[PDB]
Assembly symmetry: D3
Homo-oligomer: 149 residues x 6
């Protein structure tokens, strides 16, 4: 029952990359179990980035992430946290390999299209911060016997 938190940032929304991000996870067999588009409040973004609160760029980041709508979502599947990190690519786009989201679409670390949880512990916290238990949908994937051993 592993899950990860993925969020399309304001630049991903502006550039029309929301569907592209979702499709990369769907094609790897991962289950979409929650999604919404929203204007994130300052307090929500400060709690989301709480590990960065002591850093000089924290206020600039929180303001940028509230400057347009975001699309938080949740995917479920085997090794979805670690594979999600690989699929997004390095934080620095010039260090990202081609075929990753940031390697294909991004030029600047400050405009890198999408967030993903960096660990299981972070994923569980971020999922519960952005989504209430009622917003998490549950279903049995038909192709389940052919994606997992």
């Amino acid at each position: 029952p592993e899950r990860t938190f993925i969020m399309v940032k304001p630049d991903g929304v502006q550039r029309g990359l929301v569907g592209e991000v979702i499709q990369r996870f769907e094609r790897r067999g991962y289950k979409l179990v929650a999604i919404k588009m929203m204007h994130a409040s300052e307090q929500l973004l400060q709690t989301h980035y709480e590990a960065l609160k002591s850093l000089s760029f924290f206020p600039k980041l929180v303001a940028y992430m509230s400057s347009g709508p975001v699309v938080p979502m949740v995917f479920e599947g085997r090794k979805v946290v670690e594979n999600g990190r690989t699929m997004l690519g390095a934080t620095k786009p010039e260090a990202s390999c081609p075929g990753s989201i940031r390697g294909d679409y991004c030029q600047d670390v400050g405009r890198n299209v999408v967030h993903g949880s960096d660990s299981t512990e972070s994923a569980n916290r971020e999922i519960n911060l952005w989504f209430s238990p009622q917003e998490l949908c549950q279903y049995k994937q038909a192709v389940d016997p052919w994606i997992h051993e």
Copy 2:
């Protein structure tokens, strides 16, 4: 601004076509302004499909549309209602042209992946049934001067 209601049906979710549906609208420059994943109640489905009650086998439709999660969403832009119909393709996939969603992905009118509003009046009615006003997001598309005159 013109808006239309698009909803991925439970078979579209199962088959991993949510991102595909979204990308077809983003590709055409349309703005995503709301989206969520949910289990639709029978009462919501019966009101949504009020017009089809004069047709045979209404319980089969309600049971199909509540057999898994759905993804309702709202897109904004010029002629988005009529263009949304063309992009989805004919209701019957056999009558749909390749390049449309149903022409590319569907074999059966009863499993046709996605719903879209058939008129401006239906779009306004459906948007208000599925989304509260606070759920619709507002932003200014950077490419606006290049997608319409």
Copy 3:
């Protein structure tokens, strides 16, 4: 269980379009049940194209279809015959809609990349010419409940 006969012609093989033809049927949920690559004999081609002997330049057709390998295959699913015809596009590529195989890839009716059965009667006849019953594979598609009612 409806089935249709699809065959990539020698120009489709040369131009690297075998995977593209197969993927157009797979993404619509159709089941691949047989496939091979072969050099078709003149006797097989004359029987396959029996109905075209009433048209001019029959030796030219047999020679072209013998000028390189072909890839016959069989797909199974609801309305696969009539949808197969639409997916391939009009015989003349200049009458084919964009989104069809011939509309996307072909310039010449004489080099139109792929063959498909025009009827269920023709499909049954063509499947028997090209494949022994022992070559057809049988399996249960996991997504079956989601591609048709």
Copy 4:
């Protein structure tokens, strides 16, 4: 040797669709024989649209077509003029089929991404207006026997 004139308009340049337009023609086996990016003077655009110069929307059209770079190009192959029309789609995007350029990417006739010749006579005029003979390249396509009969 049939040829047509295709030109990406300023909105197609801005939206990063130059490669998409070119690929639509390459995948149908058409030969790129000339291409360049330029800022077209008002005077050059007035000659290209000579037929519209007395109409009320003429100053608006010339200002838009000089508001950014354009990419004129020439493609060669059988039926390239008529097939180019179908591949671009109807002038008004809302009348365009899915799978055409304007059906996939455009919302507004005034921002319809790309121009293409409407006839052999227009193609010859437009090619000779935008390109000198020395800019037209000549080569023998290796797949020629597999695209032509």
Copy 5:
């Protein structure tokens, strides 16, 4: 003759509709398809295919899984097709696979990793001869040959 490699879509690749995708990855790199078929593989054939694994604990589970649905064996031809085939498929474990590889794009689980490919030219020639008779292998001259290799 030219270098060849054996590629086979596994039962999960067939179920998930990925046969055309695998083929197209090789075609777009200029490689020539020279044989292909869909079949139910017997346990006898699969034990010989995986004979180097016969001493390992997971061998019976692997043979049973690989016979639980149809597979699509095929053969591609071209310069360095064995080595490049391995790179295109990606690492055995999908979580170690780079994005852009088949397993990195589509797979979650090493036991459901969609496709097999030969790991050496010796293996490639043994696997081709095991799954295909010489008559099933087709020969043609690729038109773009002068533009894909020097």
Copy 6:
């Protein structure tokens, strides 16, 4: 601004990959600012490859690069030189990652489809060698605030 020189080689033109190369840069937000198709002269190619002029393979490389038309072009954006190298992939295709141009399409170092500048100094020299200043176009990209921080 940062610019890099990219050139589709004669095999990339023959194989219909010109639009694919362009789209790889466009989708990463890089601006196309110059392009043309031409038959490169022996003297032009000798100057382009002047760093290799003492090597054994130099005459054969120069001869091959004039054996068909090429498509030189210029892209502009942040880190476009280093990212261009990554997007093209290793010089030898067998050392190239999947997702790069050479990793996706090439088998042979001598037929590796595309050239790209290896440094800022090389890019400036190559741009001025192949393009006169009147061929370089500039425009204000609308999505600039969403690709650069």
